[PDB]
């Protein structure tokens, strides 16, 4: 079973140049992300090698989804887990304005506009986590089943909490392609920061950028 109450509990449980600040926040939040994933029903039951594959595959989308939702009441900016706000003007002035504006326009504003709630965010994150397309999984079917149980629970929760909005479920799922795209661009930036040595990159974030 995949009860939304436990997925919400996982969310609640875990609550200077801007690129440096964002990378320092990412490294901090990777530690938190492991503690979050352990609280998602059935995750800790997967083979250790599969838990590693899923977190290596998902971390960037999972962190972006988190800081995006955290930022819904910020004007044209994001709230990092460190408590530092970053405004789009600062992002632009650091050379990362384009990807910053995609986060604001495709994620933060769309989460704000539909008032995405923490159960919904939790369920979208659990869908991301249970990615049956992650390469090298010992048993992709097992992850496919867990993803299906999450989106079944989410749709039930949407139909029960927001029964005035027939399309809310579809609307939630249709942020995932934007998140995928934004995650890939953010990862491209991080690899470049690491190549050029323009930014301190702490140990856990560096490990996530290691080859498999």
């Amino acid at each position: 079973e995949m009860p939304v109450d436990r997925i919400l509990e996982a969310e609640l449980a875990v609550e200077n140049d801007p690129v440096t600040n964002i990378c320092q926040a990412a490294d901090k939040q990777l530690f938190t992300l492991v503690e979050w994933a352990k609280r998602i029903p059935h995750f800790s039951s997967l083979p250790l090698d599969d838990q590693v594959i899923l977190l290596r595959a998902g971390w960037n989308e999972l962190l972006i989804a988190s800081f995006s939702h955290r930022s819904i009441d910020v004007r044209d900016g994001i709230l990092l887990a460190t408590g530092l706000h970053v405004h789009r003007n600062s992002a632009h002035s650091a050379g990362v304005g384009a990807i910053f504006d995609r986060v604001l326009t495709e994620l933060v504003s769309k989460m704000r506009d539909m008032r995405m709630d923490k159960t919904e965010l939790g369920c979208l994150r659990a869908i991301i986590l249970f990615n049956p397309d992650a390469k090298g999984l010992s048993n992709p079917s097992e992850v496919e089943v867990l993803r299906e149980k999450v989106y079944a629970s989410l749709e039930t929760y949407c139909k029960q909490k927001y029964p005035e909005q027939q399309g809310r479920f579809a609307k939630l799922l249709l942020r995932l392609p934007a998140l995928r795209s934004i995650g890939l661009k953010c990862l491209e930036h991080l690899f470049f920061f690491k190549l050029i040595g323009d930014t301190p990159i702490d140990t856990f974030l560096m490990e996530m950028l290691e080859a498999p």
């Binding site: 250790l48 838990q51 290596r56």
Partner: peptide
């Protein structure tokens, strides 16, 4: 080797 990630996932603390 993904040292940190393995360590954090294994640990029951």
């Amino acid at each position: 080797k993904h040292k940190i990630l393995h360590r954090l996932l294994q640990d029951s603390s």
